[PDB]
Write an enzyme that holds these catalytic residues in place. Structure first.
Site, PDB file in Angstrom:
ATOM      1  N   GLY A 175      35.695  49.716  36.973  1.00 47.08           N
ATOM      2  CA  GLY A 175      36.107  48.409  37.452  1.00 47.08           C
ATOM      3  C   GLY A 175      36.873  48.457  38.753  1.00 47.08           C
ATOM      4  O   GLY A 175      37.104  49.534  39.309  1.00 47.08           O
ATOM      5  N   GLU A 181      29.844  44.699  39.006  1.00 50.28           N
ATOM      6  CA  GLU A 181      29.630  43.865  40.203  1.00 50.28           C
ATOM      7  C   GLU A 181      29.627  44.811  41.410  1.00 50.28           C
ATOM      8  O   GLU A 181      30.385  45.792  41.404  1.00 50.28           O
ATOM      9  CB  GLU A 181      30.723  42.761  40.295  1.00 50.28           C
ATOM     10  CG  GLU A 181      31.574  42.670  41.566  1.00 50.28           C
ATOM     11  CD  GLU A 181      33.100  42.766  41.466  1.00 50.28           C
ATOM     12  OE1 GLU A 181      33.639  43.193  40.412  1.00 50.28           O
ATOM     13  OE2 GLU A 181      33.762  42.414  42.469  1.00 50.28           O
ATOM     14  N   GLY A 206      41.108  43.525  33.178  1.00 48.46           N
ATOM     15  CA  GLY A 206      39.765  43.175  33.612  1.00 48.46           C
ATOM     16  C   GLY A 206      38.763  43.314  32.494  1.00 48.46           C
ATOM     17  O   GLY A 206      38.982  44.110  31.587  1.00 48.46           O
ATOM     18  N   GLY A 254      37.247  46.897  33.332  1.00 43.67           N
ATOM     19  CA  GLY A 254      38.347  47.825  33.083  1.00 43.67           C
ATOM     20  C   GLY A 254      38.642  47.960  31.594  1.00 43.67           C
ATOM     21  O   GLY A 254      38.831  49.075  31.124  1.00 43.67           O
ATOM     22  N   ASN A 261      51.961  47.304  36.573  1.00 46.04           N
ATOM     23  CA  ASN A 261      51.911  46.700  37.902  1.00 46.04           C
ATOM     24  C   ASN A 261      53.234  46.077  38.340  1.00 46.04           C
ATOM     25  O   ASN A 261      53.555  46.167  39.517  1.00 46.04           O
ATOM     26  CB  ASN A 261      50.773  45.685  37.998  1.00 46.04           C
ATOM     27  CG  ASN A 261      49.456  46.219  38.494  1.00 46.04           C
ATOM     28  OD1 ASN A 261      49.329  47.364  38.938  1.00 46.04           O
ATOM     29  ND2 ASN A 261      48.437  45.380  38.439  1.00 46.04           N
ATOM     30  N   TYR A 306      47.542  45.024  46.897  1.00 48.46           N
ATOM     31  CA  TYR A 306      47.039  46.051  45.985  1.00 48.46           C
ATOM     32  C   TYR A 306      47.034  47.400  46.714  1.00 48.46           C
ATOM     33  O   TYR A 306      47.286  48.422  46.086  1.00 48.46           O
ATOM     34  CB  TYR A 306      45.618  45.732  45.502  1.00 48.46           C
ATOM     35  CG  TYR A 306      45.436  44.619  44.490  1.00 48.46           C
ATOM     36  CD1 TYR A 306      44.462  43.643  44.675  1.00 48.46           C
ATOM     37  CD2 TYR A 306      46.097  44.647  43.262  1.00 48.46           C
ATOM     38  CE1 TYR A 306      44.184  42.694  43.690  1.00 48.46           C
ATOM     39  CE2 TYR A 306      45.846  43.683  42.277  1.00 48.46           C
ATOM     40  CZ  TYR A 306      44.883  42.708  42.496  1.00 48.46           C
ATOM     41  OH  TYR A 306      44.617  41.719  41.573  1.00 48.46           O
ATOM     42  N   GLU A 365      46.622  71.352  27.914  1.00 47.45           N
ATOM     43  CA  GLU A 365      48.053  71.620  28.062  1.00 47.45           C
ATOM     44  C   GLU A 365      48.823  70.310  28.147  1.00 47.45           C
ATOM     45  O   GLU A 365      49.962  70.258  27.702  1.00 47.45           O
ATOM     46  CB  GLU A 365      48.349  72.540  29.256  1.00 47.45           C
ATOM     47  CG  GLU A 365      49.622  73.354  29.071  1.00 47.45           C
ATOM     48  CD  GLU A 365      49.947  74.395  30.127  1.00 47.45           C
ATOM     49  OE1 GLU A 365      49.009  74.868  30.809  1.00 47.45           O
ATOM     50  OE2 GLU A 365      51.145  74.735  30.271  1.00 47.45           O
TER      51      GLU A 365
HETATM   52  N1  LIG Z   1      47.502  48.315  40.904  1.00 48.48           N
HETATM   53  C1  LIG Z   1      46.294  47.760  40.994  1.00 48.48           C
HETATM   54  N2  LIG Z   1      45.886  46.924  40.043  1.00 48.48           N
HETATM   55  C2  LIG Z   1      44.687  46.362  40.316  1.00 48.48           C
HETATM   56  C3  LIG Z   1      43.870  46.598  41.401  1.00 48.48           C
HETATM   57  N3  LIG Z   1      42.773  45.757  41.378  1.00 48.48           N
HETATM   58  C4  LIG Z   1      42.961  45.015  40.314  1.00 48.48           C
HETATM   59  N4  LIG Z   1      44.102  45.323  39.618  1.00 48.48           N
HETATM   60  C5  LIG Z   1      44.630  44.661  38.376  1.00 48.48           C
HETATM   61  O1  LIG Z   1      43.632  44.712  37.368  1.00 48.48           O
HETATM   62  C6  LIG Z   1      43.621  43.476  36.614  1.00 48.48           C
HETATM   63  C7  LIG Z   1      42.302  42.765  36.809  1.00 48.48           C
HETATM   64  O2  LIG Z   1      41.258  43.686  36.412  1.00 48.48           O
HETATM   65  P1  LIG Z   1      40.108  44.252  37.397  1.00 48.48           P
HETATM   66  O3  LIG Z   1      40.051  45.764  37.184  1.00 48.48           O
HETATM   67  O4  LIG Z   1      40.390  43.947  38.809  1.00 48.48           O
HETATM   68  O5  LIG Z   1      38.661  43.659  37.110  1.00 48.48           O
HETATM   69  P2  LIG Z   1      37.267  44.332  36.745  1.00 48.48           P
HETATM   70  O6  LIG Z   1      37.562  45.670  36.066  1.00 48.48           O
HETATM   71  O7  LIG Z   1      36.363  44.409  37.924  1.00 48.48           O
HETATM   72  O8  LIG Z   1      36.570  43.372  35.692  1.00 48.48           O
HETATM   73  P3  LIG Z   1      35.691  42.087  36.009  1.00 48.48           P
HETATM   74  O9  LIG Z   1      35.826  41.806  37.610  1.00 48.48           O
HETATM   75  O10 LIG Z   1      36.372  41.021  35.162  1.00 48.48           O
HETATM   76  O11 LIG Z   1      34.314  42.373  35.556  1.00 48.48           O
HETATM   77  C8  LIG Z   1      44.867  42.714  37.053  1.00 48.48           C
HETATM   78  O12 LIG Z   1      45.978  43.102  36.249  1.00 48.48           O
HETATM   79  C9  LIG Z   1      45.041  43.180  38.497  1.00 48.48           C
HETATM   80  O13 LIG Z   1      46.384  42.940  38.911  1.00 48.48           O
HETATM   81  C10 LIG Z   1      44.328  47.505  42.405  1.00 48.48           C
HETATM   82  O14 LIG Z   1      43.799  47.723  43.490  1.00 48.48           O
HETATM   83  N5  LIG Z   1      45.562  48.047  42.108  1.00 48.48           N
HETATM   84 MG   LIG Z   2      35.539  43.001  39.719  1.00 46.79          MG
END
Ligand SMILES: Nc1nc2c(ncn2[C@@H]2O[C@H](COP(=O)(O)OP(=O)(O)OP(=O)(O)O)[C@@H](O)[C@H]2O)c(=O)[nH]1
Ligand SMILES: [Mg+2]
Ligand SMILES: Nc1nc2c(ncn2[C@@H]2O[C@H](COP(=O)(O)OP(=O)(O)OP(=O)(O)O)[C@@H](O)[C@H]2O)c(=O)[nH]1
Ligand SMILES: [Mg+2]
Lengths: 285, 428, 423, 184
Positions: free
Chosen positions: B9, B62, B134, B137, B197, B215, B245
């Protein structure tokens, strides 16, 4: 609340009182004949009698096997006796009462009218003529809606017959909707003609105008000449009067229900006919 | 010796980019894989032509995030087949990532991982990067963790999870996705490093002086902590030289595999000139809740394990002296059936910073890894938000529509309730 | 997750739909010829969402223009951006339902629908990854209401996996003098509650009141109302058209705005209405009842979910601070059992004429006021069994009136249960 | 092992580029002669990672069969394939590669010109003396440095005559190379 109150609920023609009064009047050893006599005494309406009998058979436990069988037999006999007069009218009880309230008439009268209407094959015209002889134009539309409610509810019955009658009633309604169109627009047309000093036939009303419109659309082989002719016969020979009506008929055509046209072509043909008539009554600008 | 990294993700892909940017700098590899001229080979395969290729796979449902990697500066670093994308995302819906959409891409991802695994003489395990909030994710990671358990049985699986924080959080349903993924991943992960975060955002604001961190700001900070954790695997090390380990030194109770990482010093680039911090100072800062990457209070819990991973100009005697001071001064209460000791590691390779980067170059740094019962505070925050919404069954129809039965929600919550009781039971 | 297919039905649909195209085309730098003459590369970043590229890099709208009234073809074509639309995408009839829902949904409308679906099909094929559909219509008429809701159902059966989002213009006595409007609005609400994923309630009562009370226009025309609609539509679709994290696609917005499948009716808001405004003044105005495009008092309900879109060059520290204050100060108006329900989005490109603006999307339990207003207007007519033969004559039956009535009163009751729902 | 070789030779036909590029790298590292004809086929792969690895592999094996196919790889679209093909041709040490490498000394990419100069020094054919002398005037300092180093591997009468001329009429770096290498 008991079955009698459930039966009386929403039913403006039966009280839980009379039903309980009837159930209490019927002994456990009452023969099917005895039951019917009692039902007939307290309830004159076959629909309400049949309703009462359903109540009676239903309010009777299977423990009273003899009575329930007598009540069942009585109801079976009553149903054998009246058939549709009881069952059909019983089926549309709500509808008859609802519209009886709007019309401030008797629900039984409406049920009788309904059975009358549904007892045989009737065309839209037969229905229209059948209703204009009984109701104000204002009330007719409401009556038509009762009949439609009743027929639709008869999805529980001359199945095939009701389908045809419904098609005919829908035609009737489509016609009435057309009359409503003229009702509102004809005065405007006449007032606008009057405002320009154009004297119009004193009796000229929306009905006569609408009737002329329908003679045109229902004409077996209409022509621009026939169109203009009917219009001239209707409003006279004043160019603005004839033009006004032809324009009204042209406007009406677009608004008339599709069911009132033999085909899509028929509507366009009529438009062309009216446009040609309007051109004929515009040469001398 | 080899480790395969999986970036799932947006959070995973974007954190992986920050990580690989740093790994390249740390080992002197250019973004084209060339190195102007063996430890780091556990993370980079070596080609006769000159190329060092990351042993990494990037997955997203995506294309937009990975398309930027494919057209970026690092486009020639990875072979294209290591970068995998779908067409429609999981729309912040765990069920889409796990069932609906995930089911389509899972088979391809696995085959690409197998192709990487087949180029390994002794694959240690996997490092999985993803967000909790996400749909990809949460949903796709758990699907993959389930399938990796089958295919690579007795192989370690270590995670780097992005614990959601309102400040950056793009979805109302993030508490649901977090509980759901953690329920299904629990028996398939051997160790999980949570990154809250809100904590990283707060460090950027407080220490790095970035008023509204992006980000990009956060990721460069996350990748410093990730680098510190994986340094042992990329350099000739003494402590955590194995993925195994990691479990042996940090995971005594197996469901309770969520260590709290603390990093010091995190100095702004703007600050220098400033006096460089000693071993004592950087160690002292590890026991300050401000420097933790998960918001919680260890002064409310008990320790099960504690690892101190030093980097730079650090002398063993200074470390022993610094630890001694912390034992006598601080309240570091360990659980009744555990070792009272601190496992120590020194990597004399100085900390690497990204040229430009919000972070300043430091002479010495430390990342402490603790398995404290205090991490259940973060579970409780998530569990409460989940409870508030689930009681009214809000947003549940989204999940049921995407091949998930409502019962999976209750089952997930029941596993969370059990995890909370487990952290409670450790506290005796 | 890329292309959106736009459909505009009826007079109102085509009027509001054409102002929408005029507005976003100017925002994206496109002239009525479809040539890009812009200023930022951001204008073309997510251009593929609402536009298709021709040879000559002629951006053409992915818009389907429908009406049973043939006259609307010319109204659209003779408009400012009238040239831009694809000539094959004009699906026009010979009649015009004349405010009869049955005519648009069952008779004249059902005849034209297949021809519309053929155009929707051809626009959906030249789509790499279709997000969903967006319909602009009025619930008060015959075509926009009847044919529009027939289309919604017909598209849902063909593209079931896609989002269906609408901009539905609620009828008002203050604007339209037509009697049967409560029937057409009640018969449509019945469809929308089962066939759309998200509906923006543009209430003509709120539009009239804004022009009359706030803008001081004593005799507001449709043009004045439409200026408010175009601005609202432009703002609610900002996260879709420009690059972004939050509410980027129709489903991401749906998953964040819709807690319950039937409770998908949104109260759109916009600030400033008239044309030296600070972030606190913008936040204050954007939440204000006086600025909502649906005639509901927010104080009469609670917000389930809220989406706040800020456009322009302003402090993000200020917006985060002001949105947080607007919540902690007004805690009791936001649903306790949906944590962090107010999601805020910033776009640096402001709308034409403004250096700073704010668009609000609320899913407030106070929207039941709007449906109640239509149910009261409906009951009073259906009581007398008024105009029933106009509808029944066209083929439909009375039971559909009683079903629409029950469904809308169940919706109002459903809103009320979550308004009163104790955490 | 003979089996690991055949396995990798089979992998040069796999649909996956990840598998093919790995197979070419592995076959180069094994150095079995059996892999020479399959690797020559891999020089025509759609994937530039596979082409590059095949070129490198062929240089590592050092078989003459690879000379004419590597000469055609000096015209590859990919700058890293070209630079590796030049490296490989110098590794093989075949005289046939001298004229094509003299042309590669004039490549648009400096890493190709640099590897062409290194290769020419490795081959040690006198035909490279005059073209390498011209490369002492290259805009790239590292290309100039490798051309001077390359002439140092060649030496002889052609080298001496070219240096005597440059120490008289040549300027800058080329003059310095001619005076310094003349002392050596
Ligand atoms: N620290 C950090 N968190 C991130 C980043 N991008 C997204 N997030 C966090 O991840 C969460 C959103 O999930 P995402 O991973 O972006 O989405 P995805 O995995 O693409 O899933 P979908 O777009 O819904 O299919 C939120 O809590 C965001 O604040 C990044 O570059 N850094
Ligand atoms: Mg996405
Ligand atoms: N705001 C707005 N409302 C409009 C507009 N045009 C009409 N309306 C409203 O739309 C409703 C009537 O619907 P119409 O769009 O005229 O009907 P239709 O969909 O064209 O169907 P037909 O009457 O058969 O042509 C009423 O509530 C009007 O107040 C417009 O330009 N803007
Ligand atoms: Mg119209």
């Amino acid at each position: 609340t008991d079955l009698a109150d459930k039966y009386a609920s929403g039913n403006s023609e039966i009280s839980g009182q009379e039903l309980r009064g009837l159930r209490d009047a019927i002994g456990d050893d009452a023969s099917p004949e005895d039951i019917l006599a009692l039902v007939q005494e307290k309830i004159k309406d076959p629909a309400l009698q049949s309703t009462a009998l359903d109540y009676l058979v239903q309010t009777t436990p299977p423990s009273q096997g003899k009575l329930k069988e007598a009540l069942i037999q009585a109801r079976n006999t009553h149903t054998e006796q009246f058939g549709r007069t009881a069952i059909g009218a019983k089926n549309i009880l709500f509808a008859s009462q609802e519209y009886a309230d709007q019309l401030n008439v008797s629900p039984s009268g409406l049920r009788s009218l309904y059975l009358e209407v549904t007892g045989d094959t009737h065309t839209c015209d037969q229905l229209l003529s059948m209703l204009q002889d009984r109701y104000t134009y204002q009330d007719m539309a409401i009556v038509s809606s009762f009949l439609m409610k009743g027929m639709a509810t008869e999805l529980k019955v001359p199945s095939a017959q009701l389908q045809v009658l419904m098609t005919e009633t829908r035609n009737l309604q489509a016609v009435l909707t057309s009359y409503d169109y003229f009702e509102s627009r004809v005065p405007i047309l006449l007032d606008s003609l009057k405002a320009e000093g154009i004297q119009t036939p004193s009796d000229l009303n929306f009905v006569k105008v609408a009737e002329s419109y329908h003679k045109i659309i229902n004409d077996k082989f209409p022509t621009a000449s026939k169109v203009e002719r009917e219009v001239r016969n209707l409003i006279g020979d004043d160019v603005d009067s004839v033009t006004g009506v032809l324009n009204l008929f042209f406007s009406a055509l677009r608004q008339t229900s599709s069911r009132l046209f033999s085909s899509a072509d028929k509507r366009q043909q009529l438009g062309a006919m009216i446009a040609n008539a309007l051109d004929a009554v515009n040469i001398n600008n | 010796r080899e480790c395969i990294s999986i970036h799932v993700g947006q959070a995973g892909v974007q954190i992986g980019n920050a990580c690989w940017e740093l790994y390249c700098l740390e080992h002197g590899i250019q973004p084209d894989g060339q190195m102007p001229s063996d430890s780091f080979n556990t993370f980079f395969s070596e080609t006769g032509a000159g190329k060092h290729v990351p042993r990494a796979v990037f997955v997203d449902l995506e294309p937009t995030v990975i398309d930027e990697v494919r057209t970026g500066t690092y486009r020639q670093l990875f072979h294209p087949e290591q970068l995998i994308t779908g067409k429609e995302d999981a729309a912040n819906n765990y069920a889409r990532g796990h069932y609906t959409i995930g089911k389509e891409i899972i088979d391809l991802v696995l085959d690409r991982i197998r192709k990487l695994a087949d180029q390994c003489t002794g694959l240690q395990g996997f490092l999985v990067f993803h967000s909790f909030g996400g749909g990809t994710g949460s949903g796709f990671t758990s699907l993959l963790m389930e399938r990796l358990s089958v295919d690579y049985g007795k192989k370690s699986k270590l995670e780097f999870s992005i614990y959601p924080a309102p400040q950056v959080s793009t979805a109302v349903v993030e508490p649901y996705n977090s509980i759901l993924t953690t329920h299904t991943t629990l028996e398939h992960s051997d160790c999980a490093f949570m990154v809250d975060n809100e904590a990283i955002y707060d460090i950027c604001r407080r220490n790095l002086d970035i008023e509204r961190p992006t980000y990009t700001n956060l990721n460069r900070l996350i990748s410093q902590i990730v680098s510190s954790i994986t340094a042992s695997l990329r350099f000739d090390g003494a402590l955590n030289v194995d993925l195994t380990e990691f479990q042996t030194n940090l995971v005594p109770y197996p469901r309770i595999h969520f260590p709290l990482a603390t990093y010091a010093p995190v100095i702004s680039a703007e600050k220098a000139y400033h006096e460089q911090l000693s071993v004592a100072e950087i160690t002292n800062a590890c026991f300050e809740p401000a420097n933790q990457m998960v918001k919680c209070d260890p002064r409310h819990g008990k320790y099960m394990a504690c690892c101190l991973l030093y980097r730079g100009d650090v002398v063993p005697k200074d470390v022993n002296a610094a630890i001694a001071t912390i034992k006598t001064k601080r309240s570091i209460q360990f659980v009744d059936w555990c070792p009272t000791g601190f496992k120590v590691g020194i990597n004399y390779q100085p900390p690497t910073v990204v040229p430009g980067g919000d972070l300043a170059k430091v002479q010495r740094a430390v990342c402490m890894l603790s398995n404290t019962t205090a991490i259940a505070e973060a579970w409780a925050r998530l569990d409460h938000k989940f409870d508030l919404m689930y009681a009214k069954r809000a947003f549940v129809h989204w999940y049921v529509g995407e091949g998930m039965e409502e019962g999976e929600f209750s089952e997930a919550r029941e596993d969370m309730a059990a995890l909370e009781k487990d952290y409670e039971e450790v506290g005796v | 997750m890329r292309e959106i297919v736009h459909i505009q039905a009826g007079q109102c649909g085509n009027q509001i739909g054409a102002k929408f195209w005029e507005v976003i085309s100017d925002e994206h730098g496109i002239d009525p010829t479809g040539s890009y003459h812009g200023d930022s590369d951001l204008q073309l970043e997510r251009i593929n969402v609402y536009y298709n590229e021709a040879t000559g890099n002629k951006y053409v709208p992915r818009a389907i223009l429908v009406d049973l009234e043939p006259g609307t073809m010319d109204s659209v074509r003779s408009g400012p951006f009238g040239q831009i639309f694809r000539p094959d995408n004009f699906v026009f009839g010979q009649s015009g339902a004349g405010n009869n829902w049955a005519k648009g949904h069952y008779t004249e409308g059902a005849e034209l629908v297949d021809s519309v679906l053929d155009v929707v099909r051809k626009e959906s094929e030249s789509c790499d990854c279709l997000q969903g559909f967006q319909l602009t219509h009025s619930l008060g008429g015959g075509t926009g209401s009847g044919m529009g809701t027939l289309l919604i159902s017909k598209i849902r059966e063909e593209y079931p996996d896609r989002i269906m989002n609408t901009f539905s213009v609620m009828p008002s006595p203050k604007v339209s003098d037509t009697v049967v409007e409560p029937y057409n609005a009640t018969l449509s609400v019945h469809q929308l509650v089962e066939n759309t994923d998200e509906t923006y309630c543009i209430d003509n009562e709120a539009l009239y009141d804004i022009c009359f009370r706030t803008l001081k226009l004593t005799t507001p025309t449709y043009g004045d109302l439409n200026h408010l609609v175009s601005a609202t539509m432009s703002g609610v679709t900002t996260c879709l058209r420009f690059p972004g994290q939050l509410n980027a696609d129709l489903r991401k917005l749906a998953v964040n705005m819709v807690p319950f499948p039937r409770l998908h009716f949104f109260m759109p808001g916009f600030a400033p209405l008239t044309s030296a405004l600070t972030v606190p003044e913008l936040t204050q105005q954007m939440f204000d009842s006086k600025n909502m495009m649906a005639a509901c008092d927010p104080r009469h309900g609670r917000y389930l979910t809220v989406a706040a879109i800020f456009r322009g060059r302003m402090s993000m520290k200020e917006v985060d601070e002001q949105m947080l204050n607007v919540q902690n100060k007004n805690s009791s108006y936001f649903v306790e059992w949906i944590p962090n329900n107010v999601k805020t989005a910033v776009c640096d490109i402001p709308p034409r004429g403004l250096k700073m603006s704010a668009t609000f999307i609320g899913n407030s339990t106070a929207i039941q006021e709007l449906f109640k207003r239509i149910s009261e207007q409906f009951t009073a007519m259906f009581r007398r069994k008024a105009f029933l033969h106009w509808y029944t004559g066209e083929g439909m039956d009375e039971m559909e009136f009683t079903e629409a009535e029950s469904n809308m009163n169940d919706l109002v009751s459903e809103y009320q249960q979550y308004q009163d729902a104790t955490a | 092992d003979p089996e690991k070789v055949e396995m990798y030779i089979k992998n040069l036909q796999d649909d996956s580029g990840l598998v093919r590029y790995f197979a070419a790298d592995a076959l180069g590292k094994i150095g079995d002669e059996r892999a020479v004809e399959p690797l020559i086929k891999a020089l025509k792969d759609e994937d530039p990672w596979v082409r590059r690895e095949a070129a490198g592999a062929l240089g590592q094996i050092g078989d003459e069969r690879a000379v004419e196919p590597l000469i055609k790889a000096l015209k590859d679209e990919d700058r890293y394939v070209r630079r590796i093909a030049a490296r490989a041709l110098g590794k093989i040490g075949d005289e046939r590669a001298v004229e094509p490498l003299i042309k590669a000394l004039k490549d648009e990419d400096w890493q190709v010109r640099e590897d062409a100069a290194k290769a020419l020094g490795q081959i040690g054919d006198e035909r490279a003396v005059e073209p390498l002398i011209k490369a002492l005037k290259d805009e790239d300092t590292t290309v100039r440095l490798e051309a001077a180093l390359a002439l140092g591997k060649i030496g002889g009468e052609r080298v001496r005559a070219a240096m005597e001329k440059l120490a008289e009429t040549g300027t800058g770096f080329a003059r310095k190379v001619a005076v310094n290498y003349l002392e050596t």
